């Protein structure tokens, strides 16, 4: 399975709240999460193939790939009865849009679809890192801020990190439609988050998402940098709950 448990649901409630991660994320990233439940749902993480217990997978290179993957794992193991939530931070944003696009379709109405921190579907990242050799590459993985400088230093590291990254960064930067038109928009209540000090992905980048979602709120500003998801956890999920207060019922 791609899904792994962060938190139980308690209290009585009954939502699911799933979350895709940014490129390069894994389960590791997420640690934070589990230290404290910050909301009465179930919380699980999606893992990218190629990492955690999907070691022995390669990693794939399309967002539309993940997405398919991830609708048809949730479609078998989500009661219809479940009010199911997605979210996803940066690349893990469009996979959760991809996804809730399958589900949508197939009629099984996900409850919400939040999207923090990504560019819209019909724009491009103003940073992109594919096309850039393993040096160049590594920098500015390090300018955005999850990335060690030890990393350059060990040629090791080098040959295990920079596939799975580089896969990643290759599909979420391959993701591009030439024009919203080019599918019907989504009528899942959409949260649009993006963060005051985000130097991955501006507000006006985040706000061009509404070119794709009928029923879309925000964006909503969350004080932090990039890593806002994480680093300023109970402001992330106070607005996530605050916003689908039919799912938390």
């Known amino acids: 399975a791609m899904c792994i448990p962060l938190w139980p649901a308690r209290n009585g409630n009954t939502a699911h709240l799933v979350m895709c991660p940014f490129a390069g994320g894994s389960s590791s990233a997420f640690r934070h999460w589990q230290a404290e439940q910050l909301a009465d749902c179930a919380l699980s993480l999606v893992t990218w193939p190629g990492r955690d217990r999907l070691r022995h997978l390669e990693p794939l290179r399309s967002i539309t790939q993940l997405a398919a993957l991830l609708a048809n794992e949730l479609e078998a193991s989500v009661s219809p009865d479940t009010p199911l939530l997605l979210a996803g931070h940066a690349m893990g944003a469009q996979v959760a849009f991809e996804t809730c696009r399958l589900l949508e379709q197939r009629g099984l109405a996900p409850q919400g679809l939040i999207i923090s921190g990504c560019h819209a579907p019909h724009l491009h990242s103003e940073r992109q890192l594919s096309h850039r050799d393993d040096a160049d590459f590594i920098a500015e993985l390090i300018d955005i801020g999850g990335c060690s400088p030890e990393l350059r230093e060990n040629q090791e590291l080098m040959s295990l990190f920079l596939p799975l990254l580089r ?30 000090h985000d130097r991955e992905a501006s507000w006006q980048q985040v706000d061009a998402w509404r070119q794709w979602l009928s029923h879309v709120t925000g964006p909503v500003v969350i004080d932090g940098d990039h890593f806002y998801p994480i680093q300023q956890a109970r402001s992330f999920f106070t607005q996530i709950v605050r916003h689908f207060p039919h799912a938390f019922s």
């Open 167 to 196: 896969a990643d960064f290759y599909a979420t930067e391959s993701y591009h439609y030439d024009s919203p038109d080019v599918c019907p928009p989504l009528r899942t209540p959409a949260l649009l988050l993006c963060g005051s």
